[PDB]
Design an enzyme around this catalytic site. Structure first.
Site, PDB file in Angstrom:
ATOM      1  N   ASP A  22      91.111  41.846  98.402  1.00 38.72           N
ATOM      2  CA  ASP A  22      90.213  41.864  97.232  1.00 38.72           C
ATOM      3  C   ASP A  22      90.100  40.540  96.442  1.00 38.72           C
ATOM      4  O   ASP A  22      90.898  40.254  95.533  1.00 38.72           O
ATOM      5  CB  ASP A  22      90.581  43.056  96.322  1.00 38.72           C
ATOM      6  CG  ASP A  22      89.773  43.107  95.026  1.00 38.72           C
ATOM      7  OD1 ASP A  22      88.845  42.290  94.826  1.00 38.72           O
ATOM      8  OD2 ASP A  22      90.083  43.976  94.184  1.00 38.72           O
TER       9      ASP A  22
HETATM   10  C1  LIG Z   1      83.904  50.900  91.642  1.00 38.87           C
HETATM   11  C2  LIG Z   1      84.500  49.518  91.296  1.00 38.87           C
HETATM   12  N1  LIG Z   1      85.453  49.149  92.342  1.00 38.87           N
HETATM   13  C3  LIG Z   1      86.655  48.403  91.966  1.00 38.87           C
HETATM   14  O1  LIG Z   1      86.853  48.082  90.828  1.00 38.87           O
HETATM   15  C4  LIG Z   1      87.662  48.022  93.059  1.00 38.87           C
HETATM   16  N2  LIG Z   1      88.422  46.770  92.466  1.00 38.87           N
HETATM   17  C5  LIG Z   1      87.700  45.508  92.383  1.00 38.87           C
HETATM   18  O2  LIG Z   1      86.589  45.463  92.785  1.00 38.87           O
HETATM   19  C6  LIG Z   1      88.350  44.264  91.794  1.00 38.87           C
HETATM   20  O3  LIG Z   1      87.781  43.112  92.350  1.00 38.87           O
HETATM   21  C7  LIG Z   1      88.165  44.287  90.263  1.00 38.87           C
HETATM   22  C8  LIG Z   1      86.846  43.640  89.866  1.00 38.87           C
HETATM   23  C9  LIG Z   1      86.721  43.760  88.359  1.00 38.87           C
HETATM   24  C10 LIG Z   1      87.287  42.655  87.475  1.00 38.87           C
HETATM   25  C11 LIG Z   1      87.128  42.804  85.954  1.00 38.87           C
HETATM   26  C12 LIG Z   1      86.431  44.030  85.326  1.00 38.87           C
HETATM   27  C13 LIG Z   1      85.874  45.129  86.244  1.00 38.87           C
HETATM   28  C14 LIG Z   1      86.024  44.989  87.763  1.00 38.87           C
HETATM   29  N3  LIG Z   1      89.306  43.484  89.890  1.00 38.87           N
HETATM   30  C15 LIG Z   1      90.290  44.053  88.994  1.00 38.87           C
HETATM   31  O4  LIG Z   1      90.142  45.120  88.505  1.00 38.87           O
HETATM   32  C16 LIG Z   1      91.524  43.188  88.717  1.00 38.87           C
HETATM   33  N4  LIG Z   1      91.582  42.856  87.317  1.00 38.87           N
HETATM   34  C17 LIG Z   1      91.843  41.464  87.009  1.00 38.87           C
HETATM   35  O5  LIG Z   1      91.952  40.643  87.866  1.00 38.87           O
HETATM   36  C18 LIG Z   1      91.870  41.180  85.494  1.00 38.87           C
HETATM   37  N5  LIG Z   1      92.909  40.280  84.932  1.00 38.87           N
HETATM   38  C19 LIG Z   1      93.747  40.745  83.792  1.00 38.87           C
HETATM   39  O6  LIG Z   1      93.524  42.074  83.296  1.00 38.87           O
HETATM   40  C20 LIG Z   1      94.838  40.177  82.876  1.00 38.87           C
HETATM   41  N6  LIG Z   1      94.150  39.644  81.599  1.00 38.87           N
HETATM   42  C21 LIG Z   1      92.973  38.715  81.999  1.00 38.87           C
HETATM   43  C22 LIG Z   1      91.787  38.555  81.035  1.00 38.87           C
HETATM   44  O7  LIG Z   1      91.422  39.855  80.317  1.00 38.87           O
HETATM   45  C23 LIG Z   1      92.654  40.469  79.653  1.00 38.87           C
HETATM   46  C24 LIG Z   1      93.749  40.807  80.671  1.00 38.87           C
HETATM   47  C25 LIG Z   1      90.477  40.573  85.163  1.00 38.87           C
HETATM   48  C26 LIG Z   1      90.037  40.412  83.681  1.00 38.87           C
HETATM   49  C27 LIG Z   1      88.648  39.828  83.347  1.00 38.87           C
HETATM   50  C28 LIG Z   1      87.690  39.404  84.493  1.00 38.87           C
HETATM   51  C29 LIG Z   1      88.128  39.565  85.972  1.00 38.87           C
HETATM   52  C30 LIG Z   1      89.519  40.154  86.304  1.00 38.87           C
HETATM   53  C31 LIG Z   1      92.849  43.955  88.970  1.00 38.87           C
HETATM   54  C32 LIG Z   1      93.242  44.783  87.721  1.00 38.87           C
HETATM   55  C33 LIG Z   1      92.714  44.898  90.187  1.00 38.87           C
HETATM   56  C34 LIG Z   1      93.934  42.888  89.265  1.00 38.87           C
HETATM   57  C35 LIG Z   1      89.859  47.106  92.008  1.00 38.87           C
HETATM   58  S1  LIG Z   1      90.020  48.780  92.116  1.00 38.87           S
HETATM   59  C36 LIG Z   1      88.702  49.154  93.289  1.00 38.87           C
HETATM   60  C37 LIG Z   1      88.067  50.555  93.100  1.00 38.87           C
HETATM   61  C38 LIG Z   1      89.099  48.994  94.760  1.00 38.87           C
HETATM   62  C39 LIG Z   1      83.388  48.442  91.107  1.00 38.87           C
HETATM   63  C40 LIG Z   1      82.860  48.689  89.680  1.00 38.87           C
HETATM   64  C41 LIG Z   1      83.891  46.986  91.120  1.00 38.87           C
HETATM   65  C42 LIG Z   1      82.309  48.535  92.224  1.00 38.87           C
END
Ligand SMILES: C[C@@H](NC(=O)[C@H]1N(C(=O)[C@@H](O)[C@H](Cc2ccccc2)NC(=O)[C@@H](NC(=O)[C@@H](NC(=O)CN2CCOCC2)c2ccccc2)C(C)(C)C)CSC1(C)C)C(C)(C)C
Ligand SMILES: [Zn+2]
Lengths: 116, 116
Positions: B32
């Site tokens: 990812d």
């Molecule tokens: C259905 C959904 N799918 C998904 O979300 C899939 N994932 C994905 O598609 C990932 O690439 C997801 C993309 C995303 C980043 C920021 C907001 C919303 C989405 N990334 C994350 O959620 C990752 N979050 C991160 O990497 C976060 N880092 C931090 O939370 C730490 N700090 C950083 C600054 O804000 C305060 C907290 C982040 C904060 C701001 C912008 C980008 C990242 C992580 C928690 C998994 C490490 C992880 S879980 C998953 C279901 C497999 C979609 C909406 C993306 C299609």
């Protein structure tokens, strides 16, 4: 373009999004292999156009209040590519305001992940 | 390897994860590029094991409650490369049991995204 992966520098691209409801606009999008579906900010849509309610499971958790679903397809033009990506449907972030280029688009532009 | 990208098909990989507080274990982790940090399931970690509380932003929003942070580095062996990824610190999913290889890891094995 090879986009190197770095925890400290998100792999982002300037993409031009056509929601078909207002003028096309260039936004910053995050290139995301984890993402099934491309996520467009709501600021790219007119006030009128209907958007379907939807439930999304991300790292935060369950959410019905936070993303909506497009009524019409969306066209994305990348800086290099001349032809537009066409996404039958995608998610609309309602509360935040940047885009996520997900595997739906990444497939249409022959995008890949290389691990040496 | 070159990993093609399909919306209908999560790019998953077999990873061996040594948390350093139990027997090393093989899991199916999602590759990812939108993850800043690697997430692994608490199921790999021992009953005692001190884990720090943490705040994490994801698609479901900010979550104080869902993820914890490792005290000790985590070793990750992948199929091809003989020598392991060592992450100083990475997230631990307590609620579900998510496996996500983020950019922290992908950099250490020189992963890139290639858009033709
Ligand atoms: C259905 C959904 N799918 C998904 O979300 C899939 N994932 C994905 O598609 C990932 O690439 C997801 C993309 C995303 C980043 C920021 C907001 C919303 C989405 N990334 C994350 O959620 C990752 N979050 C991160 O990497 C976060 N880092 C931090 O939370 C730490 N700090 C950083 C600054 O804000 C305060 C907290 C982040 C904060 C701001 C912008 C980008 C990242 C992580 C928690 C998994 C490490 C992880 S879980 C998953 C279901 C497999 C979609 C909406 C993306 C299609
Ligand atoms: Zn909410």
């Amino acid at each position: 373009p090879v986009i190197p992966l770095d925890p400290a520098r998100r792999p982002v691209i300037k993409a031009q999004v056509d929601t078909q409801t207002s003028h096309p606009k260039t936004i910053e999008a995050l290139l995301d292999t984890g993402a099934d579906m491309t996520v467009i900010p709501i600021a790219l849509f007119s006030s009128n156009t209907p958007l379907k309610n939807t439930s999304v499971l991300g790292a935060g958790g369950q959410t019905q209040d936070h993303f909506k679903l497009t009524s019409l397809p969306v066209l994305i033009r990348l800086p290099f590519r001349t032809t537009p990506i066409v996404l039958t449907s995608c998610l609309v972030d309602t509360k935040n305001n940047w885009a996520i280029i997900g595997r739906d688009a990444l497939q249409q532009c022959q995008g890949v992940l290389y691990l040496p």
